[PDB]
Amino acid sequence: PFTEIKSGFLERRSKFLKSYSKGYYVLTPNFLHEFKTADRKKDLVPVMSLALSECTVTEHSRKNSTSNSTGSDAKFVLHAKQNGIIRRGHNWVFKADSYESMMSWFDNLKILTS
Amino acid sequence: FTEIKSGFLERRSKFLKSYSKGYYVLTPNFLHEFKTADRKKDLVPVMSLALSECTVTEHSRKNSTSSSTGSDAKFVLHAKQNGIIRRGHNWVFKADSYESMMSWFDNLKILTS
Amino acid sequence: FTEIKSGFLERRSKFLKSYSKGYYVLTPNFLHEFKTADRKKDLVPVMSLALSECTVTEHSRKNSTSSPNSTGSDAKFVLHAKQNGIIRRGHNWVFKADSYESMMSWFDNLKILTS
Amino acid sequence: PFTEIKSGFLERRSKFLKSYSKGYYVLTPNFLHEFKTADRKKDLVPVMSLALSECTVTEHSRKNSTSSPNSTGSDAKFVLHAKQNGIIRRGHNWVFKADSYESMMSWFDNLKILTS
């Protein structure tokens, strides 16, 4: 009986590779977990687990954000306060499947990282 | 009241690689961002940038080219102290034309003196 | 004769925002860049990256995407410098191979050599 | 009687504005000067003068360098690096774009000898 605040697919940007890779993410009160698939029965080991206690969410796309790309209105930034999966003071960019989906991820993360 | 200039500007995000349009009001003390141009009902700035500790550094030349729109209509606001912007960091704004950009720039230059 | 791998790779320039293709030869000590694949006449490396003080950090995933009309979104890897040399300590170089499988050959070989 | 090693138009990139601006450049043994025009008779005051004594040239495009369609001059860029605070902040870099690979290589080669 897996319990979660939110889960869904997100694309995560690589700063150096300048590309996105899609994964299945699970937000709990303690961690943002990345898994390879949505199958909570057979896919049991997170690819990585980001402790929320030492992350913050800092900025997100506006509904009118433009670039010329996909999901210019659906991105948000997760910032590291301490060394872990992410280096202290560094940032990871995520792309959701819509503005409204992004806002749900952002709002939930913001409350869990206050 | 002592508003110096107001209008829509696009502001670049470094991490999101995108522009977002907002309605800005320039006063002697602040550049204020609002969501809308409704001065009666939209009263709380999204953010208020203290001009006392900002400078305007570069701006597009009339011959500036990109490609993206507004290649001749951008300027840079630089922070001298930690606030909305980290000390030493910069924000990029895009106006609707060179002439409009220069109006913003010239006004900001005097206020940040 | 103790070459481990050789072939063409594109290397990204951060300041020039472009890729340049070169012919690379991987040995136990160095990744060498040459202008051409002519091992008889083209004998002097353009540069020689000491593997002893490099690591390979990230690489593209099979599903990595970049942008329509951009090539090799699934074929890049990152070489990181642990010390000042051709690359400044803490800095990174990005390479693009001709496919995911080719990239993974380069990456796996570099991973062992930089251990 | 204006004496120069090389002169010609170059585009200079702005890091923050992500745009290029074209100017007329004059390379002498002492400086890389920027002017607004090619008229050495009426256009007498440099927009800026970069001391070569404290600059280096560090990298340049290859003949095969590729960026994206449609970009121009992917084979015609070079980087000028500051060793001391002046026009450019110490340790910072300016990117220039010439009108061809061969023109770029002429600029780069001359700058490299003058900044050795």
Numbering used by the authors:
A (entry chain D): 466 to 532, 535 to 581
B (entry chain C): 467 to 533, 536 to 581
C (entry chain A): 467 to 581
D (entry chain B): 466 to 581
Publication passage describing the model:
The PH domain-containing protein Slm1 from budding yeast Saccharomyces cerevisiae is required for actin cytoskeleton polarization and cell growth. The PH domain-containing protein Slm1 from S. cerevisiae is a component of the target of rapamycin complex 2 (TORC2) signaling pathway. We have previously reported that in vitro, the Slm1-PH domain (Slm1-PH) interacts with liposomes containing PtdIns(4,5)P2 and DHS-1P cooperatively. The core of each monomer consists of seven antiparallel β-strands with a C-terminal amphipathic α-helix connected via a long and flexible loop.
The results presented here include: (i) the apo structure of Slm1-PH that we resolved at 1.76 Å resolution; (ii) one structure with phosphoserine at 1.68 Å resolution; and (iii) two structures of Slm1-PH in complex with Ins(4)P at 1.4 and 1.8 Å resolution. We previously reported a structure for the apo Slm1-PH (at 2.0 Å) that depicted only part of the non-canonical binding site. As the interactions between the two molecules involve the backbone of β1-β2 and no specific side-chain residue, this probably represents a crystallographic packing artifact. Compared with our previously published structure at 2 Å, our new apo structure clearly visualizes the full β5-β6 loop, which plays a key role in accommodating ligand molecules in the non-canonical binding site (see below). Interestingly for all four structures, much of the binding space in the canonical binding site is occupied by the β5-β6 loop of the neighboring molecule. The long β5-β6 loop occupied part of the space at the canonical binding cavity, making it less available for ligand binding.
